[PDB]
Amino acid sequence: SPWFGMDIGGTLVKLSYFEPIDITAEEEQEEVESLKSIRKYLTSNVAYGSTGIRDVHLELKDLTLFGRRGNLHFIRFPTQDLPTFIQMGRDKNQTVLCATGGGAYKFEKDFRTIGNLHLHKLDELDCLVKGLLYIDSVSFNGQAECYYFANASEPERCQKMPFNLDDPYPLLVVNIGSGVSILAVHSKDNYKRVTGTSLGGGTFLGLCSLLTGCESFEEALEMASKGDSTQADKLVRDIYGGDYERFGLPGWAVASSFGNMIYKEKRESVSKEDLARATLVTITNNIGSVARMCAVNEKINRVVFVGNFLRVNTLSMKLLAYALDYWSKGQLKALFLEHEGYFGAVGALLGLPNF
Amino acid sequence: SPWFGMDIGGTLVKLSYFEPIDITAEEEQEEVESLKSIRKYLTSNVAYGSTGIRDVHLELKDLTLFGRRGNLHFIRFPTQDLPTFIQMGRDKNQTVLCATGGGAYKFEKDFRTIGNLHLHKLDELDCLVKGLLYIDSVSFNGQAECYYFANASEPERCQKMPFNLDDPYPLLVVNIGSGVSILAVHSKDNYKRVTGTSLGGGTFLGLCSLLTGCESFEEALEMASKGDSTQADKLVRDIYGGDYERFGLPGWAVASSFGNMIYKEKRESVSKEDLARATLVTITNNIGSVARMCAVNEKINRVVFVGNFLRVNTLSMKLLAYALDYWSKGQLKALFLEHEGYFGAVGALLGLPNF
Ligand SMILES: Nc1ncnc2c1ncn2[C@@H]1O[C@H](COP(=O)(O)OP(N)(=O)O)[C@@H](O)[C@H]1O
Numbered sequence A, B: 001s002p003w004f005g006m007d008i009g010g011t012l013v014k015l016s017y018f019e020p021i022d023i024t025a026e027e028e029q030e031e032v033e034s035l036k037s038i039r040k041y042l043t044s045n046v047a048y049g050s051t052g053i054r055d056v057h058l059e060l061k062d063l064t065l066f067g068r069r070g071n072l073h074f075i076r077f078p079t080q081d082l083p084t085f086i087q088m089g090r091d092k093n094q095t096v097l098c099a100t101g102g103g104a105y106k107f108e109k110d111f112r113t114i115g116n117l118h119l120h121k122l123d124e125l126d127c128l129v130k131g132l133l134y135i136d137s138v139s140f141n142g143q144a145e146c147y148y149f150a151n152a153s154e155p156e157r158c159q160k161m162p163f164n165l166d167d168p169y170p171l172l173v174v175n176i177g178s179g180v181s182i183l184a185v186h187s188k189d190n191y192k193r194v195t196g197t198s199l200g201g202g203t204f205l206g207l208c209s210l211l212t213g214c215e216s217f218e219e220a221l222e223m224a225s226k227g228d229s230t231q232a233d234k235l236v237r238d239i240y241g242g243d244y245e246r247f248g249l250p251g252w253a254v255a256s257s258f259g260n261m262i263y264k265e266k267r268e269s270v271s272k273e274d275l276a277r278a279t280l281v282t283i284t285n286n287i288g289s290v291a292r293m294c295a296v297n298e299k300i301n302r303v304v305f306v307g308n309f310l311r312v313n314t315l316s317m318k319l320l321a322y323a324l325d326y327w328s329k330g331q332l333k334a335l336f337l338e339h340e341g342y343f344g345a346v347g348a349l350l351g352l353p354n355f
């Protein structure tokens, strides 16, 4: 029985797979053919069908898990294609599946069409927290799992630096997926969802597709990297003529996101790339501001950002780092994690012994 | 010299004009002709040029101000047209002008092209607070200036009801204009800007114009009233298949604003009206959520919403009322004010004796 953990989100399915590398002589001796087939297929491909991807660089090697040593693999595909995944699961076969995320409930009955499968639904919260704390504890192959942007306010000196979470409490976790969930973690056994916002990664992707006609997350980011958001946004200096000193709002700060788009002549001259960047900047800064308010409310100074809105998205990471540092005068630290999209899937996998 | 107060914002100029009604026999006797001309023009028209509007229903009658009795009028026009206002001000003429808002600084030199004019810039904060507290103190011609939506969670019983602010401290003021400013008022002499968000009225209007091609705020609201935002938004039940019980998120709550627009087939079937409503709902709920976080942070349970994003916008008012009541289990009260766009202009006017 292959050991999987699965996080079925609104947009992406994330899968963690533990591959045994201590398979002795007898264990292999007629491992069921389909079991060998699965392992070979999963380890010999980096793309699965048309939409499946193994994030090879994230792989954890020579991990000891449940008394076996092995490699932990990370795989993702769109939730839209889960029916294909399930259909191919009814092709050749015994497996226990730990699943979390909203789709663990929505697609419960579908997974049960696989005859040789028991589905154990696990709570999203327990999985995220257990997964995050586990990965940081085993490290990223000896390297830090957690990092921050040192001197996030000065672009000439700003750089990614490892961050130590050996005593990770308290912690604010900001999960940016389709929507945004915010958790306060006070201990391994004590955490609560603080709030959320519906303005998250799917807002960025949805709006960006409406405004620019982009057809992928990566294309949207590529467009944004070429844009100038100030063409769409109304800035403090557009309103004051300069800075607002009395409240320390610099002239370059955004006063009204997309606020220049109320003028027809500006709508007619703005580029797609400008609109992609303004969308990214708008969604990201709003999340940063909500994150700061929760942290102040919860009296927590370490804010960790996870979820896949931030994968291959350095712009948003730097925006978040700069914003928390600026507005808090250095009291708040924006923290990031190498495996940020996969913590739910790992936590699911870790719930395996309790079944 | 006519008594004006002016609030020059990023989008609208708001003007409060005090018309004396106790003009005796000698006072009129050769009041300078241009002074009579101004008064006649202002009181005999409700539309001024192409873009100026007197909000006649807001007029305060038989007010005693600065020892004179008179009527307080409320007038608005787009900031875009301020050069026209100024040009016509150089036509016929002595006047002292109290002005607040960012444009008091940006257009300082322009106002000084009017030879017989001294411009006194006043701080936006002092004006808003003084203006709000003044109007509520004199009442809306005997009626409450402040109101709330009773039973905001049940549409069959939900209705506008007067609210008493005789002891208005403490107070959270959420000013929704082009952007959003949030103030905590602890006393008449003690208040601070808590935070803000750049996702405000200009975001709604700008995005709505990009997405739907609407050419006015009113048209945008009209489109939104005919729409179904759930066509653009991804809901909790789209992700879970139903409700999320563990954290009390109902199936109908929005999980990801515009989150369904990541799918090409849904982008192709959505209407303009759906997109207008989703824009309104998205911006409004985000403001409600930010408002709730500040209030919890500031330990204030009365939240007053002002600014012109809410004029002729019952939908957004009810959304705000419902959200604060729901999420706070009745601890927080969303409050609204009849003169909500004009408090800065009134506070400016009231600074007149100090010059
Ligand atoms: N390949 C990708 N496809 C779709 N969305 C992607 C993506 N890579 C990154 N993203 C972003 O990640 C977000 C989903 O993040 P995730 O953390 O997996 O959310 P969820 N709700 O599916 O569980 C999307 O909204 C998008 O902004």
Ligand SMILES: Nc1ncnc2c1ncn2[C@@H]1O[C@H](COP(=O)(O)OP(N)(=O)O)[C@@H](O)[C@H]1O
Residues within 6 Å of the ligand: B008, B009, B010, B011, B012, B013, B101, B176, B177, B178, B179, B200, B201, B202, B203, B204, B205, B217, B306, B307, B308, B309, B310, B311, B341
């Ligand atoms: N006639 C109108 N024209 C333009 N915007 C209008 C409007 N009536 C209401 N609005 C809304 O009010 C917002 C401006 O509110 P206001 O409080 O006067 O902002 P500001 N920054 O100009 O001082 C606009 O963004 C729009 O959403």
Ligand SMILES: [Mg+2]
Residues within 6 Å of the ligand: A009, A010, A101, A177, A178
């Ligand atoms: Mg998720």
Ligand SMILES: [Mg+2]
Residues within 6 Å of the ligand: B009, B010, B101, B177, B178
């Ligand atoms: Mg204003």
